[PDB]
Design a protein around this ligand. Sequence first.
Ligand SMILES: Nc1nc2ncc([C@H](O)[C@H](O)CO)nc2c(=O)[nH]1
Ligand SMILES: Nc1nc2ncc([C@H](O)[C@H](O)CO)nc2c(=O)[nH]1
Ligand SMILES: Nc1nc2ncc([C@H](O)[C@H](O)CO)nc2c(=O)[nH]1
Ligand SMILES: Nc1nc2ncc([C@H](O)[C@H](O)CO)nc2c(=O)[nH]1
Ligand SMILES: Nc1nc2ncc([C@H](O)[C@H](O)CO)nc2c(=O)[nH]1
Ligand SMILES: Nc1nc2ncc([C@H](O)[C@H](O)CO)nc2c(=O)[nH]1
Ligand SMILES: Nc1nc2ncc([C@H](O)[C@H](O)CO)nc2c(=O)[nH]1
Ligand SMILES: Nc1nc2ncc([C@H](O)[C@H](O)CO)nc2c(=O)[nH]1
Ligand SMILES: [Cl-]
Ligand SMILES: [Cl-]
Ligand SMILES: [Cl-]
Ligand SMILES: [Cl-]
Ligand code: NI
Ligand code: NI
Ligand code: NI
Ligand code: NI
Ligand code: NI
Ligand code: NI
Ligand code: NI
Ligand code: NI
Lengths: 120, 120, 120, 120, 120, 120, 120, 120
Amino acid sequence: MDKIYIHDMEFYGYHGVFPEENKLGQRFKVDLTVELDLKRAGESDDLEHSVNYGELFELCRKVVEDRTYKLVESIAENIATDILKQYESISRCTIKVIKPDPPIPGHYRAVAVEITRERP
Amino acid sequence: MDKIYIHDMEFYGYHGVFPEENKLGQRFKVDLTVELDLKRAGESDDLEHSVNYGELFELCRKVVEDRTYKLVESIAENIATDILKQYESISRCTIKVIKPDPPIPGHYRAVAVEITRERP
Amino acid sequence: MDKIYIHDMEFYGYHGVFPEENKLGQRFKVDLTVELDLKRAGESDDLEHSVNYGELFELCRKVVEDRTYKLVESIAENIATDILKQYESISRCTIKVIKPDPPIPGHYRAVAVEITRERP
Amino acid sequence: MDKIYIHDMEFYGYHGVFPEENKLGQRFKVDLTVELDLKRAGESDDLEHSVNYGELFELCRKVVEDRTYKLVESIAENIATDILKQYESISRCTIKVIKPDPPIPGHYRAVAVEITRERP
Amino acid sequence: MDKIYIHDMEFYGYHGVFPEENKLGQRFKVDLTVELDLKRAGESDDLEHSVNYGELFELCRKVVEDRTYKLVESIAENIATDILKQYESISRCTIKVIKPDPPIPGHYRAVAVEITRERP
Amino acid sequence: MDKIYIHDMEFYGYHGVFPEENKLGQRFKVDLTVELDLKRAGESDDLEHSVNYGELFELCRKVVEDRTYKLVESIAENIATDILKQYESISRCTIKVIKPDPPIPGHYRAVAVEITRERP
Amino acid sequence: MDKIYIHDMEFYGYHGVFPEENKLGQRFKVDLTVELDLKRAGESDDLEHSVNYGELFELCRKVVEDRTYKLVESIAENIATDILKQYESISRCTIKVIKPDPPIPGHYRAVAVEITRERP
Amino acid sequence: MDKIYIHDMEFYGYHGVFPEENKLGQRFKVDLTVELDLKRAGESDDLEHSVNYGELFELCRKVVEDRTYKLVESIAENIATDILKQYESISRCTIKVIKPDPPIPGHYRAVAVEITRERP
Ligand SMILES: Nc1nc2ncc([C@H](O)[C@H](O)CO)nc2c(=O)[nH]1
Ligand SMILES: Nc1nc2ncc([C@H](O)[C@H](O)CO)nc2c(=O)[nH]1
Ligand SMILES: Nc1nc2ncc([C@H](O)[C@H](O)CO)nc2c(=O)[nH]1
Ligand SMILES: Nc1nc2ncc([C@H](O)[C@H](O)CO)nc2c(=O)[nH]1
Ligand SMILES: Nc1nc2ncc([C@H](O)[C@H](O)CO)nc2c(=O)[nH]1
Ligand SMILES: Nc1nc2ncc([C@H](O)[C@H](O)CO)nc2c(=O)[nH]1
Ligand SMILES: Nc1nc2ncc([C@H](O)[C@H](O)CO)nc2c(=O)[nH]1
Ligand SMILES: Nc1nc2ncc([C@H](O)[C@H](O)CO)nc2c(=O)[nH]1
Ligand SMILES: [Cl-]
Ligand SMILES: [Cl-]
Ligand SMILES: [Cl-]
Ligand SMILES: [Cl-]
Ligand code: NI
Ligand code: NI
Ligand code: NI
Ligand code: NI
Ligand code: NI
Ligand code: NI
Ligand code: NI
Ligand code: NI
């Protein structure tokens, strides 16, 4: 299926299992993929046949910046649920939530979770 | 199937939903993948058994620089249509059109659309 | 002289000569360097003998996000003025304001202004 | 299936076919992917429904830093075996072990092995 | 199937359709993937159960540096053929040949061909 | 002195000592630095008290794309001469001309020339 | 004067003003420059006429990993003091201590302090 | 003074204090800067009034690939000596020799030496 992507959104948030993380905050990154037909939009040049990617950005920002969860899994799950609830034309989405600066002693680029969700 | 790629073509264009975007312009990037047999070319060293990637670059440039659409979907769709019309030996293509600097308040690397097209 | 740096701050702002830029906005980046004696702080481990770099970040954010100028020159000048007014222990500063996505048809990484300021 | 990732872990280790490599050591990098249901965790915000990625990091560190094998294949195989033994909720994993600085005269970014493992 | 990778080999070669390219030369890059069982190697720590990646590097170097073809397709095809001829334990390979600096007026990262080959 | 920068302009051009380079062309990059007082502009927000960096970009583009020289030295020298002739308020400039893909068999990022010029 | 550099050392440490930082830890990076005559070493090929850069690395690691300070200023100051105390042949050093993931809500690459020290 | 640069030359070499390094080899990188008047060349377009940067590359390659020293200091010193001996028009040079993959247990980008040399 055709795809809309938003790559490497960066937010500052307060999610985390440790209370110290909830106090200090840290970077969170999100990669978004949504699956939908884009042919009608590409033939007509009419945005009403697609999904406004500015709205998709704001949907992600709300989950990461305006809420606080323990788990990155909860960020991913809530983004996916909100997308499918709000956009009937999107059949499936893949949400990757990245924690690049976790409190793990060691050397690495990032930890992340990734889920793919569709309706029943 | 075997593939020809052109990675991260960069164009300056005027596409966009907002009239201000049509006035100012911005960067657009394109990733191209085309699927075709390359074995006859790889065995013969004869370009007539493949597709000249310089021509593929120019085909993309024409759509992005010489036309102006509202939607990135229209850029992708027109590139794919032109490829399949001009190159009978290409069975399928995947076109990703990237808008790295959209007028979205926030922090991210890029927004993009991606389509895969083949003939009926 | 010793230095505090903040590298590659990224803000979304509305500065620009063209009215279309003031409507759409774009990325702005800032590099900050301030010059001050750090030896008293490095020997005592007491932040009172240095300058809190979180405050320096917020000072830059206010100029870039909470105001709108025509010129990147005005962003740099106002950041430098605010630093010298507020931190008597800083003797000089260098402020670089970067516009990575200006409305210039062409291929480049960024345009920028850089100033160094001290008191009379 | 949903995934947890740890990207680009960097370790210093002593693995290698040549005895000189066992003496000098070199960088080793690991990419980890584990497959498991994350929906129960994303709905409950309860870490007991997922796998702690700090533990996954430490499991990898033990294999790369606390043991010495001739082959990168042995690093990958032991990481995969340990994951599946310790985490019943993980159904499959993909482990990539990267040797970026091998003693190969030439110019390249890295050599690597990658395996995917599941239970019988 | 398990994989051995060699990422981003860089060679200087003389391949090209235009005689001027055959005179001047340019960079060529190769990504190699070979598919084979690695479990016996990962369990035994015995290199005789795998394929020496230094030999794979040299096989690629020979094709790119010691021969001159018109087409990048010929580079890819000859590398794949040599791999399958020399290593009975490799069941399939994917060879990507990248020309990052072709004589195409325009702005892009690279052009490339990619083939996957197995025995009849 | 205060500075305006344009970083990493990329042009496709035909400069070079070898006739084959003049036929095929290649990438050329330019870094520009100009020195001028920016305080009047930063205090007034009036572009008339600075130098329009879009004009500086076009000045460089003309030299690199609309002319063909043997030497990168000639590109740099002509850019600097044109800047000083056209902008009396610029007291000095530093021009770096980069050839990232020269016909040199070997492994490197780029070759370059850099000059600093002012009036007698 | 001639220089030895160590670029972008990465350590995990517990420094910081906030108690939560001392509990969680974070990445710290260090750039080291030391100034000394290298001509005797370059003519003789005898390490006794230079300074072993592996020892310089370990000196930095001890300060960043084996101690905990409130300020990055204290890390830099102690590294510089230890270098000058231990290596009479080094006449001056520049130490840059980088905190890439501080608890500052915002978007940036890093904050840092940099000092240059010599003997009275 | 005007400059010619060659950035990030990469060679495979066998230099090192430990005998194991002389057996295995590793990457070495070199940055070259030479200072000379470029105005005569930039005005005349005649390479005879400059220094051929392809010759400078080969001069560096000979030292790094065709000789083996214990110290990176010796690589830098010999490159600088050869440049000044062979090019009377070069008045000064700065040579940086980088060892990105030394046998130092730890996490860093590279170690390096840098020297600046001129004639008596
Ligand atoms: N699966 C999963 N595992 C985790 N482990 C630890 C933490 C902590 O908040 C810190 O990131 C590291 O200790 N968070 C998570 C998490 O969100 N998901
Ligand atoms: N799917 C889709 N959504 C869009 N939303 C907004 C805009 C605007 O032109 C700007 O990019 C952002 O407001 N363009 C698009 C677009 O082309 N495609
Ligand atoms: N020195 C200087 N020159 C400029 N030229 C054009 C623009 C416009 O806003 C756009 O960035 C490009 O047309 N801004 C500036 C500016 O701030 N400073
Ligand atoms: N498949 C495989 N091949 C190898 N070839 C050589 C070496 C040596 O230790 C050095 O990396 C290079 O000579 N290691 C390996 C290895 O682990 N796996
Ligand atoms: N498929 C394919 N197309 C090509 N087109 C042009 C050239 C020329 O040598 C230059 O790269 C560009 O004109 N080479 C190729 C090639 O190898 N393969
Ligand atoms: N100083 C200087 N040296 C050069 N050497 C060779 C070439 C050739 O055109 C190719 O770039 C490499 O052979 N150009 C130059 C040049 O412009 N400047
Ligand atoms: N000069 C200087 N300023 C600082 N401000 C805040 C913090 C805190 O530990 C956090 O990094 C940010 O709040 N540390 C420092 C510091 O070490 N140095
Ligand atoms: N100044 C200087 N110090 C060194 N220390 C160790 C080694 C060894 O060969 C390895 O690189 C690291 O142990 N080489 C050097 C060197 O060339 N220069
Ligand atoms: Cl919808
Ligand atoms: Cl065709
Ligand atoms: Cl489990
Ligand atoms: Cl085999
Ligand atoms: Ni319609
Ligand atoms: Ni034929
Ligand atoms: Ni005090
Ligand atoms: Ni439960
Ligand atoms: Ni066996
Ligand atoms: Ni005025
Ligand atoms: Ni001696
Ligand atoms: Ni002459």
